[PDB]
Amino acid sequence: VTLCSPTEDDWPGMFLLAAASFTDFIGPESATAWRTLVPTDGAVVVRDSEVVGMALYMDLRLTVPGEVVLPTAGLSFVAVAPTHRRRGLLRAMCAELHRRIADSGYPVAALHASEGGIYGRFGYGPATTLHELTVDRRFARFHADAPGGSVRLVRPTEHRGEFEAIYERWRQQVPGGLLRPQVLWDELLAEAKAAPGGDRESFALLHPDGYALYRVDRTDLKLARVSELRAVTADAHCALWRALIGLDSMERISIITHPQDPLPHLLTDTRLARTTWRQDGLWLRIMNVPAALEARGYAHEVGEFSTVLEVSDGGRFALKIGDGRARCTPTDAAAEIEMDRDVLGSLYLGAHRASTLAAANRLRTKDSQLLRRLDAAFASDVPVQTAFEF
Amino acid sequence: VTLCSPTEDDWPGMFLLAAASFTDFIGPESATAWRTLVPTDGAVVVRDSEVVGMALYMDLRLTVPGEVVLPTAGLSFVAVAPTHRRRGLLRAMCAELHRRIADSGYPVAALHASEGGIYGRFGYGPATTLHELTVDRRFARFHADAPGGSVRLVRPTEHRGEFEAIYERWRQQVPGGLLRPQVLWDELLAEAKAAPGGDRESFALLHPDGYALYRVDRTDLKLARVSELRAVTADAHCALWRALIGLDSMERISIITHPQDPLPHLLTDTRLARTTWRQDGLWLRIMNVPAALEARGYAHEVGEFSTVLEVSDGGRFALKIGDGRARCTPTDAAAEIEMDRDVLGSLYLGAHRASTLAAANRLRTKDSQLLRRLDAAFASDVPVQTAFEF
Amino acid sequence: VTLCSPTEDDWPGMFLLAAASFTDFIGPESATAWRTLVPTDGAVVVRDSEVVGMALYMDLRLTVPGEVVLPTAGLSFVAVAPTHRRRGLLRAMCAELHRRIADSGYPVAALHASEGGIYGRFGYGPATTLHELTVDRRFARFHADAPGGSVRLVRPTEHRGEFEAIYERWRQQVPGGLLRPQVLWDELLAEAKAAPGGDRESFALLHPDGYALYRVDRTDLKLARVSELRAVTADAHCALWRALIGLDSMERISIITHPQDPLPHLLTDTRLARTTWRQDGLWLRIMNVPAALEARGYAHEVGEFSTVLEVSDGGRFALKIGDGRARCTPTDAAAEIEMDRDVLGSLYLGAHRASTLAAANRLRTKDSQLLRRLDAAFASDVPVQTAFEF
Amino acid sequence: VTLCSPTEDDWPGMFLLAAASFTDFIGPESATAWRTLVPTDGAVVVRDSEVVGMALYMDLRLTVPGEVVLPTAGLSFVAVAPTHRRRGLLRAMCAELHRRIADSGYPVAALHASEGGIYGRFGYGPATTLHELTVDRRFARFHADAPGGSVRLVRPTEHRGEFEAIYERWRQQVPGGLLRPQVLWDELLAEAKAAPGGDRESFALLHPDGYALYRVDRTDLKLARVSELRAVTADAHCALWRALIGLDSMERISIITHPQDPLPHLLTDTRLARTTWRQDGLWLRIMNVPAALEARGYAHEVGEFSTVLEVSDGGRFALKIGDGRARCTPTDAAAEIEMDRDVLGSLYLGAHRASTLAAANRLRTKDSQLLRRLDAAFASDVPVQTAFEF
């Protein structure tokens, strides 16, 4: 087997492995748009001579706590032929891409994981939580305190400019936000069209400061699935949900959102917004510990403290956090905190508490006070959300 | 209809309404043990003359952030006859018990709610979250970092003393903890016996600093249900879970736990600990705002700040928080924060973020900085858990 | 009603009855390929004047024990209008086709039965067994003794020549094998293309001496269905299954195979290859008892014996079996074995033991020793498989 | 940990591990009857001091091809505490019991396996196949050839003598038969009584030469489950099935039987007897290869042949088979057949063909002719059945 950058001739072999590996890849036209986001030298293939393994990264922009945008290597299109399992092909491909990503100056990489037991060992930590709420909208009454009591029903394709502009405001403001380039809007609005023997037509609820894309389920005609709700204000979020609760021909509204979605609190019965599903969303690998820890904002409420952080096989650093900024500098002083690289990725966007990872011995410290300070500092003011799967 | 304290002769009528209202009440012997926790004047009945409505409170001890134990009025045994709906019987009974509870000097009341749309309007806020994890234990491997790699399989009835002592340590240390008196241990260990055409025998996994009571499901013989796992140390929690993952004849282990249960992080695949169910656990009504806000501990990391808190129809208070202590004193100065009483109950044990209740307009403030300070201060160092249903 | 050979003008009426009778017949283009296998005078229709009944046979080549290929009349396209039940239309059509098949010199006829209670009375015996194995491939580990530890993932349409050649070797070597002409390869590879609102794309695992065609289930995206696995060697069979167990995004692999499929024995846990479904496959009617009994090979291990076989209303024969060859000649000597014609079809490819049919009194003999000799002689060295449905 | 024979004081600890390990063990009274079949020194326990592991064997009598009865060590009551997995406790206990079983002069051991991946490595091969048939009895019509067209509906407890005598004839005549002592009849007839919140009453269909015990399913009141059908003659088997098809208030009859059950062939529609479940039944470990190979009968139809059989780490033997008898004697001549010990157990009662185990490379030989001779010789005239689980 040989690991090399793919040639134009290697692409048909990649498209075949893709079709066999992913239920979401239909054919070459499926790749056209995502491929525009792959840099020169962004891809590796393993040849046997047919393609038996592939992996690439895409140039992305990820928003992190403090509204800081990081160049981010989005790992994607990762597959090993069913003929070639247990030959370390994934280890080799990830090691080569991580080399190129680090040398190219990316502070972090990110992916969505098809299984939860794979990417931990390559330094990726689950960093956002997908939280499915299902509302029995037939009982839903808004609380007296709920805002409203502004939104228009529209065809997505006739308001592209306004979705683009609302999303752009949303992604810059929310940790987990990704820049969504032209070609990904082209794909999104092509999926909005009804599919013969497939998904139904998508409709949109448009507010000046928010939108919701939703579609009636292919088989359950009493279920509306919100694919996407981007709200820049609490008013937009409430207004949009009043409209979704107004889909009177539906029994149930489902959305994949985040754990801190305020929806339940908009209702007289919080229990109506039922959690039907939870899973890891975006995974992060911190490529450069100092660049990542320095780039992001920290809680202003915690007072200035100093410690020494060791990442297992990732360096040791004097970490000083105060006025919501971090300085992270080389040191050989005794470590006060130790953790594998994945644990740091899981901490980085505020989705997992340090004290929770400590109780499981994934983060190790002998100062329970330093543990409380870590928790408070790495917390995100704005709750972390998931932008889109790649 | 007449609302009065029940006579000894009124009890049979109460036992009948109970049997008809609750699927967990079998007959008079069902009440013997809970009744020892009801004070003189702890109960009201509505007569028509048969019992058509009843409610009572029990003398409980609830642990709150900072390991402070509060005398707590546990509302229980609440029923309105199906013949007497929409006549304000529940409003009248709750108003009378709240009078007696406030006059008796209880700073808080608590309940478990049969529906989520009832008790908000009587000032009760959902204050803990039940979080069901189901582990496909056939794939569960412990992470390298996981502690262990101490527990004994025992009959519960032969180790009462040691369960009592571990629970007693657990309940004093964890927000949501309740004192469990002799008679509730008598009931718990009577349920542990196998029931003809009912639940199977309960077994116990005993560690010096923790226990788990579990039982094979009545119908699904590949599912083990953990009724209760009390761990005083991270080592006890990990040791106990290694033992539960060792139930090799089971496919699945389910437990009702709390959102911050470290279990997922003990595994190479975090996704194996699936959230199968979420719901409100304990509800709190703050009877006395100053006594409750002063009694509990606050985060040391937030710096001293001062504000004015109004509870809708519950008073206005100068609130000063610093060194993890609150002073809460009468004032007529302009409110900076407003909220209904239920919202304060939901904040009180740290289960709901102020910024989440604000985004839904349940908590109102014009200083986003004061909002961040509220969040950080009301956070609990030790994650809030649910002791037992009543 | 009139039973006659169909005219070109009768075909549209046949295509209509077909569309109404079979869920697998879409329209005239559905018949083009199968029709090339129908000889002049191979078809009958019953007219009322519209077509109310039809039946035909196709010219096939069936492999039987000893690698002997028989000209075989494949009954197919059999339907009676829902308007014309219980008028003996099926009896009349089968009697006419059996006349023409016998006169044309076919030693056997064969069919696949839509119900199990129809064709027994026309002399057809179930002769192969379909055996669905479903593997929970997430637990499947190969035994130390298992071969391998050679196959390529390919698009079927780009390797037609190599599938044709492997199948051709397979069908000549295995009892139940059918010759698959060009036009049936045209159809097979046309089904391999993904269908809008239909089956997904088929992929292929290609070995020098074997192939597997498989497809992800239309609705269950964790199930891969093997449509066809043709292995000429034990190495090819094992190599192909290692590749199928390598479909890591699947939970389950299902195949319709034969009872003696060695797959279970390739695993450390034989129980993982679960039998999810069993049914009769190919049915045989012996048209000419002497020609059929003489054409096939018998077990070399049984010693030369002689008996007299009566087929109810099918003749009586002196049957001498030795050196794996049979002589079967007319006689009026006392019968030692009696059975209906269907029973002989069920014995013929080795799928059903004589002693099993005897215990049910379908085969009658007064010598338990002759019964043991029949069992051993009619056994097939190579286990009987099912080629393709028609 | 210490492995020793259990003391009378160790029994309560064993009863506790049992209740926690097996859903079929209710308490000490559950063991009384099985314990009478355990010889002095038949049991081992591992102490930590509480019981954390146990295993024992029972003195059984197993019928093998040629109606030969073997003293058989029935492994049973095998458990490792959930606290003590992956410490080789099962390996140690099986090694000690195998020592004592071999020294005591047992030619074979047997067990029923709770999982299919455990006992292969200790030399146990699956030796019988459980085959669940479910009959939609509303369509079942007996074939014209079917016998009958003698049985009485009785209470089991009033005809113990006649069940005992029929079973005793059955078990001596059928490979897989076990002697059923008094105390196991006491248990069987105690289970026949209806259980409060449990199984319904068992009824019996009694023929001079056969019986069926059946019970209506606890939840599905249209399903009758045959627990046991012992037929000494084909007439008894047919007569009994006519009676079961006469349970006109039922939709479905289910029985766990053997693959060669003639039932399907008693019907005009063979497809009505649907295979709903298949699994390994009895597992065999050959303790002494020569004693086991010599004790059993072989097919008279195969001619005298000689070979050299090696069992991996179990000796090499000159094996001569002719006139349905084997001589099996020590040799150092070149092996012609090799296999692990488990493979020999799987061959021993005729349930698995040598050529099937060869195709999976579990049995290795370079003479395809010797393979055909092995198949034919190890075949059982009387189809192997499963007596009762232990």
**How many whole angstroms separate alpha carbon C52 and alpha carbon C21?**
11
Name chain D contacts of B214, Cβ cutoff 8 Å: none
**How many whole angstroms separate alpha carbon A178 and alpha carbon A172?**
8
Length of chain C: 390
Handedness of CA B128, B75, B68, B238 (dihedral sign): negative
Least CB–CB distance from A50: residue in C152, C197, C247: C152
Q: Hey, which CATH number is domain A286-381, 3.30.930.10, 3.30.1050.10, 3.20.20.70, 3.40.50.2300? A: 3.30.1050.10
Q: Which chains touch B (3 or more CB pairs under 8 A)?
A: A, D
**Structure tokens, D78:** 């095998």
Name chain A contacts of B362, Cβ cutoff 8 Å: 143, 145, 265
**How many whole angstroms separate alpha carbon D4 and alpha carbon C382?**
51
Identify which of B193, B221, B185, B199 has the alpha carbon closest to the alpha carbon of residue B36. Answer: B185
**How many whole angstroms separate alpha carbon A286 and alpha carbon A281?**
16
D339: β partners: D311, D363
- The chain A residue lying nearest C199, using CA atoms, is A197
Query: Which parts of A158-265 fold into alpha helices (H)?
Result: 160-173, 182-191, 234-245
Q: Which residues of A131-147 are buried (b: 16+ CB within 10 A; e: fewer)?
A: bbbbbebeebebbebbb
Containing B309, the helix (H) or strand (E) segment is strand B305-311
**How many whole angstroms separate alpha carbon C21 and alpha carbon C44?**
16
Strands laid side by side in the B223-231 sheet: B152-154, B203-207, B210-216, B223-231, B252-257, B129-136, B273-280
The per-residue DSSP string of D221-232 comes to TTEEEEEEEEES
- The chain D residue lying nearest B198, using CA atoms, is D197
Rounded to 5°, the CA angle C120-C122-C126 comes to: 35
**How many whole angstroms separate alpha carbon A72 and alpha carbon A76?**
12
Name chain A contacts of C196, Cβ cutoff 8 Å: 196-197
User: Using the beta-carbon criterion (under 8 Å), do B275 and A272 form an inter-chain contact?
Assistant: no
User: Using the beta-carbon criterion (under 8 Å), do D82 and B243 form an inter-chain contact?
Assistant: yes
Name chain B contacts of A383, Cβ cutoff 8 Å: 355-356
Domain D128-280 has CATH 3.40.1350.10: no
Containing A296, the helix (H) or strand (E) segment is none
Annotated catalytic residue, options C119, C122, C124, C211? C119
For residue A108, say whether it is annotated as part of any ligand binding site: no
Strands laid side by side in the A152-154 sheet: A152-154, A203-207, A210-216, A223-231, A252-257, A129-136, A273-280
B108: β partners: B72, B286
Annotated binding-site ranges of B for acetyl-CoA? 78-80, 86-91, 114-115
Least CB–CB distance from D23: residue in B198, B203, B221: B221
User: Using the beta-carbon criterion (under 8 Å), do A303 and B301 form an inter-chain contact?
Assistant: yes
Strands laid side by side in the D337-339 sheet: D325-330, D315-322, D305-311, D337-339, D363-365
Residues 6 or more apart whose Cβ sits within 8 Å of residue A347: A125, A354, A357, A363, A374, A378
Q: Is residue D276 a contact partner of residue D130, using CB atoms and an 8 Å limit?
A: no
Containing C293, the helix (H) or strand (E) segment is helix C289-295
Q: Is residue A338 a contact partner of residue A348, using CB atoms and an 8 Å limit?
A: no
Rounded to a whole number of angstroms, the distance from the CA of A279 to the nearest CA of chain B is 6
Separation in Å, CA D13 to CA B26, B208, C55, D18, D159: 34, 20, 72, 9, 38
3-state secondary structure B39-70: CCCCEEEEECCCEEEEEEEEEEEEEECCCEEE
Residue of B249, B250, B251 to mutate, interface with D, max D Cβ within 10 Å: B249
Q: Which amino acid is present at B298?
A: Y
**How many whole angstroms separate alpha carbon D54 and alpha carbon B383?**
41
Q: Which amino acid is present at D90?
A: L
Q: How many CB atoms lie within 10 A of CB B114?
A: 11
Least CB–CB distance from D196: residue in B153, B196, B201: B196
Separation in Å, CA A67 to CA A327, B153, B260: 18, 52, 26
Q: Which residues of A are catalytic?
A: 119, 390
User: For B202, phi and psi rounded to 5 degrees?
Assistant: -90, 140
Q: Is residue B81 a contact partner of residue B52, using CB atoms and an 8 Å limit?
A: yes
Using DSSP's 3-state secondary structure scheme, residue A44 falls into strand
**Structure tokens, B198:** 């009912």
**How many whole angstroms separate alpha carbon C235 and alpha carbon D196?**
56
Separation in Å, CA A58 to CA A97, A109, A207, C323: 11, 10, 31, 71
Length of chain B: 390
**How many whole angstroms separate alpha carbon B349 and alpha carbon B72?**
14
Containing A259, the helix (H) or strand (E) segment is none
Containing A53, the helix (H) or strand (E) segment is strand A51-64
Residues 6 or more apart whose Cβ sits within 8 Å of residue B20: B79, B81, B82
Strands C210-216 and C203-207: antiparallel
Q: Which amino acid is present at C189?
A: L
Strands C305-311 and C337-339: parallel
Query: Cα A44 from chain centroid?
Result: 23
User: Using the beta-carbon criterion (under 8 Å), do A83 and C194 form an inter-chain contact?
Assistant: no
Length of chain D: 390
**How many whole angstroms separate alpha carbon A106 and alpha carbon A94?**
15
Q: Is residue C244 a contact partner of residue C263, using CB atoms and an 8 Å limit?
A: no
For residue A202, say whether it is annotated as part of any ligand binding site: no
Domain D1-127+281-285 has CATH 3.40.630.30: yes
Strands B325-330 and B282-286: unpaired
Range(s) for CATH 3.30.1050.10 in chain C?
Answer: 286-381
**How many whole angstroms separate alpha carbon A190 and alpha carbon A178?**
20
**How many whole angstroms separate alpha carbon A128 and alpha carbon A282?**
5
Q: Position of tokens 């989520």? A: B116
Q: Is residue A133 a contact partner of residue A274, using CB atoms and an 8 Å limit?
A: yes
DSSP designation for A334: P
For chain A, first and last CA: distance in Å? 27
**How many whole angstroms separate alpha carbon A42 and alpha carbon D344?**
56
**How many whole angstroms separate alpha carbon A241 and alpha carbon A232?**
14
Half-sphere exposure of C253 (CA within 13 A, CB side): 28
Q: Is residue A384 a contact partner of residue A350, using CB atoms and an 8 Å limit?
A: yes
Handedness of CA D177, D183, D186, D191 (dihedral sign): negative
Strands laid side by side in the A315-322 sheet: A325-330, A315-322, A305-311, A337-339, A363-365
User: For D368, phi and psi rounded to 5 degrees?
Assistant: -60, -30
Using DSSP's 3-state secondary structure scheme, residue B346 falls into helix
User: Using the beta-carbon criterion (under 8 Å), do B248 and D82 form an inter-chain contact?
Assistant: yes
DSSP designation for A156: G
Annotated binding-site ranges of D? 78-80, 86-91, 114-115
For chain C, first and last CA: distance in Å? 27
Residue A90's region, left for phi above 0, alpha for psi from -120 to 50, else beta, is alpha
Separation in Å, CA C381 to CA C300, D104, D373: 10, 41, 10
Using DSSP's 3-state secondary structure scheme, residue D246 falls into coil
Strands B108-112 and A2-4: unpaired
**Structure tokens, D53:** 């592991």
DSSP designation for D267: B
Q: Is residue D323 a contact partner of residue D329, using CB atoms and an 8 Å limit?
A: no
Using DSSP's 3-state secondary structure scheme, residue D264 falls into helix
Name chain C contacts of A82, Cβ cutoff 8 Å: 153, 205, 243-244, 246-248
**How many whole angstroms separate alpha carbon C316 and alpha carbon C311?**
6
| Cα dihedral A227, A231, A237, A240 in deg (nearest 10) | -50
Least CB–CB distance from B362: residue in A259, A265, A372: A265
Q: Is residue D308 a contact partner of residue D319, using CB atoms and an 8 Å limit?
A: yes
Q: How many CB atoms lie within 10 A of CB A98?
A: 19
Name chain B contacts of A272, Cβ cutoff 8 Å: 116-117
Q: Which chains touch A (3 or more CB pairs under 8 A)?
A: B, C
Q: Which amino acid is present at B10?
A: D
Q: Position of tokens 């507010």? A: A207
**Structure tokens, C207:** 């070995």
**Structure tokens, A243:** 């409209």
Least CB–CB distance from C249: residue in A21, A26, A50: A21
Rounded to a whole number of angstroms, the distance from the CA of D370 to the nearest CA of chain B is 42
Q: Which chains touch C (3 or more CB pairs under 8 A)?
A: A, D
Containing D140, the helix (H) or strand (E) segment is none
Q: Which residues of B are catalytic?
A: 119, 390
**How many whole angstroms separate alpha carbon B271 and alpha carbon D23?**
29
**Structure tokens, C250:** 């699947």
Least CB–CB distance from B153: residue in D26, D81, D198: D81
C152: β partners: C206
| Cα dihedral B80, B82, B84, B88 in deg (nearest 10) | 50
Rounded to 5°, the CA angle D361-D362-D363 comes to: 90
| Cα dihedral D159, D163, D165, D167 in deg (nearest 10) | 180
Q: Is residue C270 a contact partner of residue C133, using CB atoms and an 8 Å limit?
A: no
The per-residue DSSP string of D288-317 comes to SHHHHHHHS---SSSPPEEEEEEETTTEEE
DSSP designation for D366: S
Q: Is residue D105 exposed (0-12), middle (13-18) or buried (19+ Cβ within 10 Å)? A: exposed
User: Using the beta-carbon criterion (under 8 Å), do A376 and B372 form an inter-chain contact?
Assistant: no
**How many whole angstroms separate alpha carbon D195 and alpha carbon B197?**
9
Query: Which parts of chain A fold into alpha helices (H)?
Result: 11-21, 32-35, 89-103, 160-173, 182-191, 234-245, 289-295, 341-348, 354-359, 368-378
DSSP designation for B267: B
**Structure tokens, B263:** 């279990």
**Structure tokens, A163:** 């979705």
Q: Is residue C107 a contact partner of residue C328, using CB atoms and an 8 Å limit?
A: no
Residue of D275, D313, D347, D373 to mutate, interface with C, max C Cβ within 10 Å: D275
**Structure tokens, A176:** 């987990």
Separation in Å, CA C260 to CA C351, D124, D385: 10, 21, 18
Q: Is residue A346 a contact partner of residue A352, using CB atoms and an 8 Å limit?
A: yes
Name chain A contacts of B147, Cβ cutoff 8 Å: 361
**How many whole angstroms separate alpha carbon D293 and alpha carbon D295?**
6
**Structure tokens, A229:** 């709700």
Q: Which residues of B14-25 are buried (b: 16+ CB within 10 A; e: fewer)?
A: bbbbbeebeeeb
Name chain D contacts of C362, Cβ cutoff 8 Å: 143, 145, 265
For residue A115, say whether it is annotated as part of any ligand binding site: yes
For residue C79, say whether it is annotated as part of any ligand binding site: yes
Q: Is residue A35 a contact partner of residue A181, using CB atoms and an 8 Å limit?
A: no
Range(s) for CATH 3.40.630.30 in chain B?
Answer: 1-127+281-285, 128-280
User: Using the beta-carbon criterion (under 8 Å), do C201 and A23 form an inter-chain contact?
Assistant: no
Please give the resolution of this entry in Å, rounded to 1 decimal.
Answer: 2.4
Integer Rg of chain B from CA: 22
Q: How many CB atoms lie within 10 A of CB B138?
A: 15
Q: How many CB atoms lie within 10 A of CB C190?
A: 10
**How many whole angstroms separate alpha carbon D258 and alpha carbon D229?**
11
Task: Flag whether C touches A (3+ CB pairs, 8 A cutoff).
Answer: yes
